[PDB]
């Protein structure tokens, strides 16, 4: 969490 | 500022046992930031580097892995180094990671190079760990000191006029290398435009030209964009980081682009290797790999 997770 | 004292303390934990912190003083870290800042501003924003050198991708606070990379590759200045960014956030030891890297930049300013990643940016730090780490282990004033230093990092490097290096990737706004050279520092990472794209964009096998990036910022670019860029600018290779890749390195566009990612078992959520690229005197590329646990 996509900033990437 | 006692660089050797600082470096010695940072390296004392070699051979542990990942977990053990190295806690420098606030004044020491401030000094690392201020002195490295000065050096970054004194050198071009688009670095022109010589081979041979080692190139590393994302580290993300995996300090004990950084130490393994140096153990494998040679501790500075035994090899020249270029790092592609993303030193902080996600991992457990961002402070040790960035402090060792800044100390080496100050000790070996013409043989050790650090580019800016998308995580060397306050708004991203705020969310992805480094702000919290600084607040916990030091204070938020020191976090701002780091941000001030990050805002002066160079953005791209070209090795012997043939390997173009940057953290993220190409930009639909990048027509001339002079556009990079003209960028004034200190600067934040903007949410759009050339500097944003250099730190955020990704290659994509499924996109022809430019595509939407699911990160919510910047773009994706296809193999033909890479081919055209290398031809226009008389380059042989794009070297970038920014994306986790299973082998630690991964080629794209008929080996005209390579992604390097140097943090193995990223976040303990991936089973990836970490790689460092060795570029020899004639620009031949090989790899040193931290295989996953
Ligand atoms: Cl870690
Ligand atoms: Cl924390
Ligand atoms: Cl953009
Ligand atoms: Mn990145
Ligand atoms: Mn990253």
Curated annotation (Swiss-Prot), chain B:
UniProt remark on cofactor binding: Binds 1 Fe cation per subunit. Binds 2 manganese ions per subunit.
EC code(s) of this entry: 3.1.3.16
Induction: Up-regulated in synovial fluid mononuclear cells and peripheral blood mononuclear cells from patients with rheumatoid arthritis.
Residues at the active site: 119 (proton donor)
Cell compartment(s), UniProt: Cytoplasm; Nucleus; Nucleus, Nucleoplasm; Nucleus, Nucleolus
Pfam families xrefs: Metallophos (PF00149), STPPase_N (PF16891)
SUPFAM superfamilies linked: Metallo-dependent phosphatases
InterPro entries, alphabetized: Calcineurin-like_PHP_ApaH (IPR004843), Metallo-depent_PP-like (IPR029052), PP1_catalytic_subunit (IPR050341), Ser/Thr-sp_prot-phosphatase (IPR006186), STPPase_N (IPR031675)
Residues annotated as binding Mn(2+) 2: 58, 86, 118, 167, 242
Catalysis: reaction(s): O-phospho-L-seryl-[protein] + H2O = L-seryl-[protein] + phosphate; O-phospho-L-threonyl-[protein] + H2O = L-threonyl-[protein] + phosphate
Regulation: The phosphatase activity of the PPP1R15A-PP1 complex toward EIF2S1 is specifically inhibited by Salubrinal, a drug that protects cells from endoplasmic reticulum stress.
Main location, first listed in the record: cytoplasm
Modified how: Phosphorylated.
Functional summary from the UniProt entry: Protein phosphatase that associates with over 200 regulatory proteins to form highly specific holoenzymes which dephosphorylate hundreds of biological targets. Protein phosphatase 1 (PP1) is essential for cell division, transcription elongation, and participates in the regulation of glycogen metabolism, muscle contractility and protein synthesis. Involved in regulation of ionic conductances and long-term synaptic plasticity. May play an important role in dephosphorylating substrates such as the postsynaptic density-associated Ca(2+)/calmodulin dependent protein kinase II.
PANTHER family: SERINE/THREONINE PROTEIN PHOSPHATASE, SERINE_THREONINE-PROTEIN PHOSPHATASE PP1-ALPHA CATALYTIC SUBUNIT
Name of the protein this chain belongs to: Serine/threonine-protein phosphatase PP1-alpha catalytic subunit
Lineage, broadest ranks: Eukaryota, Metazoa, Chordata, Craniata, Vertebrata
